[PDB]
Amino acid sequence: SRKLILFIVFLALLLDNMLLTVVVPIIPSGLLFASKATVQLITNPFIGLLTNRIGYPIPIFAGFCIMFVSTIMFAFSSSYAFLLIARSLQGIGSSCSSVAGMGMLASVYTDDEERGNVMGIALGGLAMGVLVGPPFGSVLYEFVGKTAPFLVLAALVLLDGAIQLFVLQPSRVQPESQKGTPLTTLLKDPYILIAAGSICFANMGIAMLEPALPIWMMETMCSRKWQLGVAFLPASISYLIGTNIFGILAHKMGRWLCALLGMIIVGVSILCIPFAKNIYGLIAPNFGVGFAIGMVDSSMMPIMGYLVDLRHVSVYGSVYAIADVAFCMGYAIGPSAGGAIAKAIGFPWLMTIIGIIDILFAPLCFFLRSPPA
Ligand SMILES: NCCc1ccc(O)c(O)c1
Structure with missing residues (x-):
C-alpha cells in the first residue's frame, strides 16, 4: 500500500x-x-x-x-x-x-x-x-x-x-x-525558486550554526565537552516536533504563511544566539531555530509538489531533485564558509548576517499565497 x-x-x-x-x-x-x-x-x-x-x-x-x-x-x-x-x-x-x-x-x-x-x-x-x-x-x-x-x-x-x-x-x-518538464524550465519559475531558496537559506543557517557553535562555546562559555554535545539537542528534538506537527498544520494555516513565519523565527532565533552567556542561554534560541527549520521544510516540500502540479506537468522527480539541491547546498558550503566568516569577523557577526538574511528573505514567501496556473 x-x-x-x-x-x-x-x-x-x-x-x-x-x-x-x-x-x-x-x-x-x-x-x-x-x-x-x-x-x-x-x-x-x-x-x-x-x-x-x-x-x-x-x-x-x-x-x-x-x-x-x-x-x-x-x-x-x-x-x-x-x-x-x-x-x-x-x-x-x-x-x-x-x-x-x-x-x-x-x-x-x-x-x-x-x-x-x-x-x-x-x-x-x-x-x-x-x-x-x-x-x-x-x-x-x-x-x-x-x-x-x-x-x-x-x-x-x-x-x-x-x-x-x-x-x-x-x-x-x-x-x-508522461515526460516531465525539463529541469531548466523548472529553474526559471519564480515560485519554485522561492520555495527552493527558503529551504536553502533555512538549512544553510542551521548548517553553518552547528559546527560554529562549539568553536564559540569553548571560547566564550568555557564549556566542557559534554556540554558541546548537549547544547545542540534542542535543535534536533525541535525539528522532529516541528516537522511532525506542521506537516498537518501548514495546510490548515496556509503553506505560505507557515513558511513566512518559519523564516522569521529562524531569523530571530539565530539573531538571539550570540546574546547568550551560559549554556542555559542556548536552549530557547536553539529550540526556536530547529522548530522553525521544521516549520519551513514541512511547508515548502509539499509546496514544491503542488507548484509542479499546478503549473507544470505532474512529474515530481526533478522538482524534488531541486528541493534536495537546496538542502545539500547548505550542508556542503556550511562548515567551510561558516568557519571562514567566523575566523574573519567573528561568530556573533556570522549569526547576525544569517539572521538578517533569513528575516529579509521571509517577505518573499508572500508570493506563494496564490501563484497563477
Ligand atoms: N533538514 C534538517 C535540518 C536539521 C535538523 C536537525 C539537526 O540537528 C540539524 O543539524 C539539521
Whole structure:
C-alpha cells in the first residue's frame, strides 16, 4: 500500500542520517566533511531526470545497495582516500534515496492535504536519524568495538533493503506515463525558486550554526565537552516536533504563511544566539531555530509538489531533485564558509548576517499565497 512506501522513505532517510552522524564522531579516529554533500548535490539532478526514465522503484532501490556498500566500506577502512570514497558513495546513495523517495511519496500521495503530512513524517525521519545517531554510535563503538557501529548499521540497512525489495519490487524498468518538464524550465519559475531558496537559506543557517557553535562555546562559555554535545539537542528534538506537527498544520494555516513565519523565527532565533552567556542561554534560541527549520521544510516540500502540479506537468522527480539541491547546498558550503566568516569577523557577526538574511528573505514567501496556473 502507500503507508509502506512512507515507511520505506522514512527508514531510508533515518538510516542515511544515522550513518552521516555516526561517521562524525568516529571520523577523527576538511574536504571529507563536505564530500558527501557536494557529491549528492552533483548527482541530484541526474537522479531527478532518471526517475522519469526508469521510474521511482529502481533509483530508490539502488540507494540501498549504494548506502550498504558505503556502510561496509566505512567499517573496514584505514586510509583517507578510502574514507573519502565511502563518503562520496554515501552521497550518491543519499541522492538516490532522498530524491527518488520524495518523488515516490509525492506521486503516491497525490492529494495536497495528505502529501503535506506524509512529507512531514518523512522529514521527521531526518530528525529522528540525527537525534539517535551519536548515542547509538558511541555506545556500540566503545561497548563492543570500532567496527561495531558500522556493521550494525549495515545490518539495519540490509533489513531496510529487504523491506524495500518486498514492497517496491524493483525488478522491472517502468518509465513515467508522461515526460516531465525539463529541469531548466523548472529553474526559471519564480515560485519554485522561492520555495527552493527558503529551504536553502533555512538549512544553510542551521548548517553553518552547528559546527560554529562549539568553536564559540569553548571560547566564550568555557564549556566542557559534554556540554558541546548537549547544547545542540534542542535543535534536533525541535525539528522532529516541528516537522511532525506542521506537516498537518501548514495546510490548515496556509503553506505560505507557515513558511513566512518559519523564516522569521529562524531569523530571530539565530539573531538571539550570540546574546547568550551560559549554556542555559542556548536552549530557547536553539529550540526556536530547529522548530522553525521544521516549520519551513514541512511547508515548502509539499509546496514544491503542488507548484509542479499546478503549473507544470505532474512529474515530481526533478522538482524534488531541486528541493534536495537546496538542502545539500547548505550542508556542503556550511562548515567551510561558516568557519571562514567566523575566523574573519567573528561568530556573533556570522549569526547576525544569517539572521538578517533569513528575516529579509521571509517577505518573499508572500508570493506563494496564490501563484497563477
Ligand atoms: N533538514 C534538517 C535540518 C536539521 C535538523 C536537525 C539537526 O540537528 C540539524 O543539524 C539539521
